Design a protein around this nucleic acid. Structure first.
Lengths: 386, 386
DNA sequence: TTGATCACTAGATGTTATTAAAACCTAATATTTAAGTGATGGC
DNA sequence: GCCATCACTTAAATATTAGGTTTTAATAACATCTAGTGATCAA
């Protein structure tokens, strides 16, 4: 017996009004399916949101514990397990996802096998185990039948494009996605709509269409109850304001932090966004992570020191950074910081170069802003953002 | 009997020294395979360069007529037909290519079928009949066996990226290509090496690494006897010099013009390049096409007039142009010309904006060069090329 | 009588098992190639 | 002579075929779901 079923039986003992409340939370017209759920092993809901919405309404702080136990006991050959796979991936519950994938790829239900194989390609691609070319050839070789995996085969590519700064094919590919063709799995259909909204938001951020960016993140927020998408929406909204409005950026990052303070990963993401924000605006910075040796966190240390004319401490931190293997995006920040410290325009030109090499039309604002304050032609600097 | 065989028999009648000359032109140690070629229907050469090199040496002005007749009589189940397919594609002989493809996709030799299907995807992709996504899914579904089609499956993608200005995935993909794995078809192997050189040249041009660009096109030239690659290599070399080195750009364009002035496809290419060159350098310009009413040719007219302070003739030409439907690229030149004529910088900023909207990293050099000559920050202008 | 619990139901959704027909190896068998050899035969 | 022509030839590189898997597609057979119904049992 699954943890969720035991917990629902206990709360029923203490309060016999619950089954009609839970039925409406689950989108059911009467609670007869809930009685069967508690009394009979292996009984699933036709739509996965029935159980997800009860867990979020009744056991919000135990979602992981309960849904992990529930998902990992599911018969992998069912619609419910297919829904669990998307649930796991959307919530970034990767230990759950990878176990589901590994038993779905070997099962004899053809739909579950296809979903499992498609999500495995996504996991392999997002972890740089395979190239984009290899991934899409594998997708073609699968002979995809379901409208669900037809849509996700495009979404997983869009995530790869985003993670590698390859924005130009994104607009055309995202337009091909047709969620209206999905008729079996409404849980997946609705979570994919959320994913589309957040991807559209990130594309607009990249195009520097900042109002549209916010409108898409707001659509994402209205369409979801999933923490991961709420987190990345607030992060995107805040990022879209980072160079123009300290207080509104801060409000979005503090909102994100307040909903995610209990999760170490999301906590640290908002701490890092607040840290970046306070360094951009040259304020005192309580968010600096002196314990990290990652490139990102050391750069913020240096930035804060330079902001306060603590040049030996800044130089110490850059000497530590000189000894590390930077990617192009990392190098661009490195040159921005060296430029601020040494007060040397040449570094800002290299910083801009490396931001252009990493297709970053966002943080490039840092060296552009310095050159603006050094008196360079504003029109040229605006044209460099394009 | 194929036309080439009849022609070779005729020239033998008039001059009985030819078979040993032809054997060495064909890379053969003795001419016994040539005797068999003339005397026995369906006898092919182990390497397709044997026949191609004879045709280019003895019948240079009849290459199309002869090779068309030869290719279209070939048994499509052979190595020779597979070579002919690449020959047709490299030379842009599309009527020949599409007939070969159509009989190869239906034939019962598994290698020819594979080559035929891969080239069909290439033809469909380069004609925008399918998307890149659909193309590579089809490639994966083919289950490619041959090293040749493994390499070409990457090359055909690289061409798509190039034609759509999507340069960022090019460097990573081209590195995966491994020509040393090809052991069967040396004609294909060597033509693909040429193709790699010219793609490398275009990648470097896009990165604004102009010396490297030239080095790759020069390697392409030395590796080929195929007019298409010679043409596009001289065009690229000259284009890489257009804004910086008049005499060298001119020399490359005149070479290109020399080899292509007789040929309807390519003739105009170098006339247009010479026209652009002479307008950039503000010289007398015999290459202006007053007979065209295309937007590009009228813009060149206006440019030449403004270069010589012929302002009423320039205004006449712009009044004609005002009345036409411009795309973004055309608008960018429109603003460049307005800028030169009316002598204000503001127009050069709009010109640059519109070049950036049409992803043109080439003609953008026109307004950048004016701003450079007006004394603006050269580093910023260089950074605008990226 | 309320109301909670639960096993029935029907009809729509989902899942599995059965085929037959395509497709894919692969390894034997057979064919075709380049480049020596030696026969004609016209000078 | 001695040189062009060209059928043999060898062994290496190519092409074909026939077979037995495996893969794929379609659908008939089976099962599970929601949301009504009506039984108990408890006030």
């Amino acid at each position: 017996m699954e943890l969720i079923r035991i917990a629902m039986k206990k709360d029923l003992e203490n309060d016999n009004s619950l089954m009609n409340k839970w039925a409406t939370v689950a989108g059911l017209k009467n609670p007869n399916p809930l009685y069967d759920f508690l009394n009979h092993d292996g009984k699933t809901f036709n739509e996965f949101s029935s159980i997800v919405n009860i867990v979020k309404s009744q056991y919000p702080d135990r979602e992981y514990e309960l849904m992990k136990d529930y998902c990992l006991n599911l018969d992998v050959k069912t619609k419910a397990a297919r829904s669990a796979l998307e649930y796991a991936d959307a919530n970034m519950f990767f230990e759950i996802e990878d176990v589901l994938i590994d038993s779905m790829i070997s099962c004899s239900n053809m739909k579950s096998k296809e979903y499992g194989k498609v999500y495995k390609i996504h996991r392999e691609l997002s972890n740089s185990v395979i190239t984009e070319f290899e991934a899409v050839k594998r997708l073609g070789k699968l002979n995809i039948k379901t409208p669900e995996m037809n849509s996700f085969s495009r979404l997983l590519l869009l995530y790869h494009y985003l993670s590698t700064g390859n924005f130009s094919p994104m607009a055309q590919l995202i337009k091909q996605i047709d969620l209206s063709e999905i008729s079996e799995n409404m849980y997946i259909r609705n979570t994919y709509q959320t994913r589309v909204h957040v991807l559209m938001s990130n594309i607009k951020l990249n195009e520097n269409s900042l109002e549209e960016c916010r409108e898409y993140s707001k659509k994402a927020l209205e369409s979801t109850n999933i923490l991961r998408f709420q987190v990345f929406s607030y992060l995107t909204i805040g990022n879209s304001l980072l160079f123009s409005n300290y207080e509104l950026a801060q409000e979005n990052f503090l909102k994100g932090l307040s909903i995610s303070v209990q999760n170490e990963n999301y906590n640290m993401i908002f701490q890092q966004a607040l840290c970046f924000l306070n360094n951009v605006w040259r304020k005192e910075n309580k968010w600096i992570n002196f314990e990290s040796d990652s490139i990102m966190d050391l750069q913020e240390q240096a930035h804060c020191f330079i902001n306060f004319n603590e040049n030996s401490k800044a130089k110490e931190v850059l000497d530590k950074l000189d000894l590390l293997v930077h990617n192009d995006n990392e190098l661009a920040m490195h040159y921005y910081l060296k430029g601020r410290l040494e007060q040397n325009k040449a570094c800002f030109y290299s910083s801009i170069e490396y931001f252009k090499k990493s297709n970053d039309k966002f943080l490039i604002r840092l060296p552009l802003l310095e050159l603006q304050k050094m008196g360079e032609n504003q029109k040229l600097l605006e044209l460099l953002l394009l």
